[PDB]
Design an enzyme around this catalytic site. Structure first.
Site, PDB file in Angstrom:
ATOM      1  N   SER A 146       4.314  58.430  15.633  1.00 34.47           N
ATOM      2  CA  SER A 146       4.883  59.870  15.617  1.00 34.47           C
ATOM      3  C   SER A 146       5.594  60.366  13.961  1.00 34.47           C
ATOM      4  O   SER A 146       5.956  59.445  13.259  1.00 34.47           O
ATOM      5  CB  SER A 146       6.459  59.395  16.480  1.00 34.47           C
ATOM      6  OG  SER A 146       6.346  60.240  17.716  1.00 34.47           O
ATOM      7  N   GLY A 147       5.412  61.382  14.074  1.00 36.23           N
ATOM      8  CA  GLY A 147       5.871  61.911  12.538  1.00 36.23           C
ATOM      9  C   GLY A 147       4.625  61.477  11.558  1.00 36.23           C
ATOM     10  O   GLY A 147       4.596  62.065  10.372  1.00 36.23           O
ATOM     11  N   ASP A 199       6.880  70.842  16.788  1.00 39.32           N
ATOM     12  CA  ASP A 199       7.364  69.625  16.432  1.00 39.32           C
ATOM     13  C   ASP A 199       7.051  69.300  14.934  1.00 39.32           C
ATOM     14  O   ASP A 199       6.238  68.601  14.456  1.00 39.32           O
ATOM     15  CB  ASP A 199       6.628  68.619  17.236  1.00 39.32           C
ATOM     16  CG  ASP A 199       7.344  67.267  17.322  1.00 39.32           C
ATOM     17  OD1 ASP A 199       8.603  67.063  16.564  1.00 39.32           O
ATOM     18  OD2 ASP A 199       6.429  66.141  17.668  1.00 39.32           O
ATOM     19  N   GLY A 222       5.605  55.116  18.204  1.00 41.01           N
ATOM     20  CA  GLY A 222       5.685  54.439  16.891  1.00 41.01           C
ATOM     21  C   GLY A 222       4.891  55.181  15.706  1.00 41.01           C
ATOM     22  O   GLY A 222       5.377  54.699  14.705  1.00 41.01           O
ATOM     23  N   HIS A 229      10.949  65.823  16.265  1.00 36.05           N
ATOM     24  CA  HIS A 229      11.506  65.047  17.201  1.00 36.05           C
ATOM     25  C   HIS A 229      11.959  63.770  16.611  1.00 36.05           C
ATOM     26  O   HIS A 229      12.190  62.566  17.212  1.00 36.05           O
ATOM     27  CB  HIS A 229      10.748  64.846  18.345  1.00 36.05           C
ATOM     28  CG  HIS A 229       9.415  63.735  18.147  1.00 36.05           C
ATOM     29  ND1 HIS A 229       8.320  64.253  17.867  1.00 36.05           N
ATOM     30  CD2 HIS A 229       9.400  62.333  18.278  1.00 36.05           C
ATOM     31  CE1 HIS A 229       7.419  63.143  17.683  1.00 36.05           C
ATOM     32  NE2 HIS A 229       8.047  61.982  17.761  1.00 36.05           N
TER      33      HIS A 229
END
Ligand code: CA
Lengths: 175, 223
Positions: B177-178, B84, B175, B40
């Protein structure tokens, strides 16, 4: 490099508060709650009867922990300032004498009942505008093959409901 | 990262920051020319910035590399938050030093109870929004599959796992994320999703990297 953008051309922040206004300033103002039918308090989500009212500050959230709303992500929409009886500020879709309608619940709701929306930008590019999709879950493949529209009622309340040919359009404005 | 502490300049040499004019997602360096993030966090024209602490300003250890290839997991399902995971190839190998280093892929899934290091430049407050200048750190344990699913009934697949605290207080946030979730020296997870931040009975849900490793090595071997 993304999609969900407010009015001022700035990225829509995940979990932030925004006003949801129509594209054409003739359909109504921002979003707000209202007491319709036989409800004990304001549990119905409608458009401001006013046409210049920014409405209610609304939070837009995604499960993802990103600064912004990922394209294609399902989102929940809740009132930044919840009303009286709502056990949650988040909208959901429940069957009503009118048909599926956007309501607030007095029952604590699980993610599945709230993460049922998804913004979709419009063709007329001249300013950031979006249609609101309604996505009811299925079997680990929630399908967004329905829209949320406006149904003006017996008392004038522009209540948000599920339609398939009377979809509404919105522009987001940082609250 | 809410309820965590300041890592200290470059103490997480594999922490990467995906930039599209500004920081929008964390990532993890797995070797000189491949980065791992969340599906995402996909965007066109990604600039991967390595050896960063203060993402707002230049400090002398950064390495800015434009993304060459951004392969999002074929099975990514934006609705269900499943698969994801995303891979990124750098247009140019990164110079591996003490400030910029790779993190070992997990060849074995970690068991619940394992302590992990979650890292990121995301919001550090539960209610409210306050993004940090420098990398924040947080130690959190891998939660059991039954508790995870207990917190998120009907939303947990075998490609995700919870880590954090049912009590709340400490957790990953917007923020982050990933970003990476390193346990026992291996990238066991990727900051993926969650309901709120530091909320009770709502821990972080991470992409279960160990199920994807065979795929990671394959793609890296053919792209
Ligand atoms: Ca810097």
């Amino acid at each position: 490099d993304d999609d969900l953008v407010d009015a001022e051309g700035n990225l829509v922040e995940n979990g932030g508060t925004y006003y949801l206004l129509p594209h054409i300033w003739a359909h109504g103002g921002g979003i707000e709650t209202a007491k319709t039918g036989n409800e004990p308090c304001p549990l119905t989500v409608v458009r401001s009867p006013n046409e210049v009212s920014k409405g209610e500050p609304i939070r837009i959230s995604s499960q993802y922990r990103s600064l912004f709303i990922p394209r294609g992500s399902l989102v929940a929409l809740g009132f930044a300032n919840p009303p009286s009886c709502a056990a949650s500020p988040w909208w959901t879709v429940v069957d009503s004498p009118q048909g599926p309608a956007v309501k607030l619940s007095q029952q604590k709701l699980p993610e599945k009942d709230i993460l049922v929306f998804k913004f979709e930008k419009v063709s007329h590019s001249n300013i950031h505008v979006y249609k609101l999709l309604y996505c009811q879950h299925d079997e680990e493949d929630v399908k967004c093959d329905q829209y949320i529209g406006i149904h003006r009622d017996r008392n004038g309340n522009r209540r948000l409901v599920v339609t398939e040919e009377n979809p509404l359009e919105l522009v987001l404005l940082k609250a | 990262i809410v309820g965590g502490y300041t890592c200290g300049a470059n103490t997480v040499p594999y922490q990467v920051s995906l930039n599209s004019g500004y920081h929008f997602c964390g990532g993890s360096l797995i070797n000189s020319q491949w980065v791992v993030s969340a599906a995402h966090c996909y965007k066109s024209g990604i600039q991967v910035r390595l050896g960063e602490d203060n993402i707002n300003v230049v400090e002398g250890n950064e390495q800015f590399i434009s993304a060459s290839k951004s392969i999002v997991h074929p099975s990514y399902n934006s609705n269900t938050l499943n698969n994801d995971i995303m891979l990124i190839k750098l247009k140019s190998a990164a110079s591996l030093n003490s400030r910029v280093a790779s993190i070992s892929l997990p060849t074995s899934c970690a068991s619940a109870g394992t302590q992990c290091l979650i890292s990121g430049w995301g919001n550090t407050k539960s209610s409210g929004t306050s993004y940090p200048d420098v990398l924040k750190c947080l130690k959190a344990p891998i939660l059991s599959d039954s508790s995870c699913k207990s917190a998120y009934p009907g939303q947990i697949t075998s490609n995700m796992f919870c880590a954090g605290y049912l009590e709340g207080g400490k957790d990953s946030c917007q923020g982050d994320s990933g970003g990476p979730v390193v346990c026992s020296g291996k990238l066991q997870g990727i900051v993926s999703w969650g309901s709120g931040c530091a909320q009770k009975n709502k821990p972080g849900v991470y992409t279960k990297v160990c199920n994807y490793v065979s795929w990671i090595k394959q793609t890296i071997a053919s792209n």
